[PDB]
């Protein structure tokens, strides 16, 4: 049985699944859940994710609940061998070490962000809390392409699909004209095929938060 | 070379790794990093991880950042072939998406809560409004133990020990007594050998934050 996607694209954590899908030519059942209308509240959904989140994973008996649980057994199921989920030891705790700094800092702050501009309008926010808060994801991921070519070493690998989604995200806001490596980096994803996979989820959050938080991302920010 | 964690045991995903460490007899070396002082500020430490958090896991070249890769490099470096880390990917999947609830979800709120009181001062923080986002994880934890004894599954896995420092730093606030499954399944880690080394860490973590927060917990 081939895997079932539950997603909206708008979400960062889903493009980055829907790039790997694309990247390995992978067939998988597409199941959207527009989480701007709560169908991740639908009773059935929630007895599947009881976290109402996607990307939701169905693959066979296998239900997965986080985008970086769903990059790794698709890469391993998938890219078998492969040099996107590396198979020395080192090099794949080097990854799955940048994958959890997605999860646990870069996407948890542009989360805080974004659902503060939800909550509370664009006008009311704190901008430059999240401006500074935002500014030391860029340096620490500066800092990654100081040592290395790609996030996690030297070509491409399951934190690039991961990382990217997320930063192309929290660029609608806060440029980065101060960051060489990490607009280099960018630069380099967007040249990728797989990287059109990122494109129409992008707009179609940029349009669904600036309308809701009534405000404009200033178009000068985003590398195009 | 021994591993070497850089370490404050008011973490609750430091204690985690301490918990794994007794439970498999790891030979570490311990280097303590006075979070209350900013001590994971200072330029050695921040160039070594820029992320400026414990636990962070030196060991030979390689250098981890984050919780729950140490806990996976452990158990296969120290652990192969045991049932904390679980072989069949089916299996081992569950646990690590399990370990991934710890990090996005049960973690998130709690370090979202625990911040809003050093932030703002505990008699001013929205305590109803964690309650709720804190209670709702213990329901989603009490729907996982529907019909396993542990977390992940019929025996204790990496996601248990994760979780449980965390939940155990969570019960300093709020209580698990609506919460039959979840209340059984914490009493039952707190039997565990290893448990032992999430005592002394959450009591001090208690002590500051009461402390910091010019307040005292229930
Ligand atoms: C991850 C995500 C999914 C969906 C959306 C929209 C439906 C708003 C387009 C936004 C985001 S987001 O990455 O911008 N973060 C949030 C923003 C607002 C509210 C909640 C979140 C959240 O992450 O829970
Ligand atoms: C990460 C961290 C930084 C500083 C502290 C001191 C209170 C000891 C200064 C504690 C922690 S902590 O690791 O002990 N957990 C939290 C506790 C309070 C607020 C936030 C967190 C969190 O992690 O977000
Ligand atoms: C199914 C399996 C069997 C044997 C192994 C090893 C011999 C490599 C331990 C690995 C796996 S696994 O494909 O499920 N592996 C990981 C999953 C998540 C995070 C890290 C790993 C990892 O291999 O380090
Ligand atoms: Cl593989």
Same mark, same amino acid.
């Not at 030297?154 to 690998?157: A, E, I, R």
């Not at 095929?193 to 809701?212: F, I, P, W």
């Given at each position: 049985?081939?895997?079932?996607?539950?997603?909206?694209?708008?979400?960062?954590?889903?493009?980055?699944?829907?790039?790997?899908?694309?990247?390995?030519?992978?067939?998988?059942?597409?199941?959207?859940?527009?989480?701007?209308?709560?169908?991740?509240?639908?009773?059935?959904?929630?007895?599947?994710?009881?976290?109402?989140?996607?990307? *939701?994973?169905?693959?066979?008996?296998?239900?997965?609940?986080?985008?970086?649980?769903?990059?790794?057994?698709?890469?391993?199921?998938?890219?078998?061998?492969?040099?996107?989920?590396?198979?020395?030891?080192?090099?794949?705790?080097?990854?799955?070490?940048?994958?959890?700094?997605?999860?646990?800092?870069?996407?948890?702050?542009?989360?805080?962000?974004?659902?503060?501009?939800?909550?509370?309008?664009?006008?009311?926010?704190?901008?430059?809390?999240?401006?500074?808060?935002?500014?030391?994801?860029?340096?620490?991921?500066?800092?990654?392409?100081?040592?290395?070519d790609f996030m996690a070493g030297?070509?491409? *690998?399951l934190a690039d699909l991961s990382?990217?989604?997320?930063?192309?995200?929290?660029?609608?806001?806060?440029?980065?004209?101060?960051?060489?490596?990490?607009?280099?980096?960018?630069?380099?994803?967007?040249?990728?095929?797989?990287?059109?996979?990122?494109?129409?989820?992008?707009?179609?959050?940029?349009? *669904?938060?600036?309308?809701?938080?009534?405000?404009?991302?200033?178009?000068?920010?985003?590398?195009?």
């Open positions: 049985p081939k895997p079932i996607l539950y997603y909206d694209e708008r979400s960062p954590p889903v493009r980055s699944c829907l790039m790997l899908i694309k990247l390995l030519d992978i067939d998988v059942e597409l199941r959207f859940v527009n989480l701007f209308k709560g169908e991740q509240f639908q009773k059935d959904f929630l007895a599947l994710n009881p976290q109402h989140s996607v990307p *939701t994973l169905v693959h066979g008996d296998l239900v997965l609940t986080d985008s970086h649980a769903i990059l790794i057994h698709l890469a391993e199921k998938f890219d078998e061998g492969g040099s996107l989920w590396p198979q020395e030891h080192a090099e794949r705790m080097k990854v799955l070490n940048l994958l959890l700094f997605e999860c646990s800092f870069l996407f948890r702050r542009d989360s805080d962000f974004m659902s503060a501009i939800v909550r509370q309008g664009f006008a009311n926010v704190d901008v430059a809390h999240h401006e500074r808060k935002l500014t030391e994801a860029y340096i620490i991921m500066e800092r990654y392409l100081e040592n290395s030297p070509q491409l *690998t990382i990217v989604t997320t930063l192309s995200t929290v660029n609608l806001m806060f440029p980065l004209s101060q960051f060489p490596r990490l607009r280099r980096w960018f630069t380099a994803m967007q040249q990728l095929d797989a990287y059109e996979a990122n494109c129409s989820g992008l707009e179609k959050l940029r349009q *669904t938060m600036e309308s809701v938080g009534s405000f404009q991302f200033p178009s000068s920010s985003a590398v195009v």
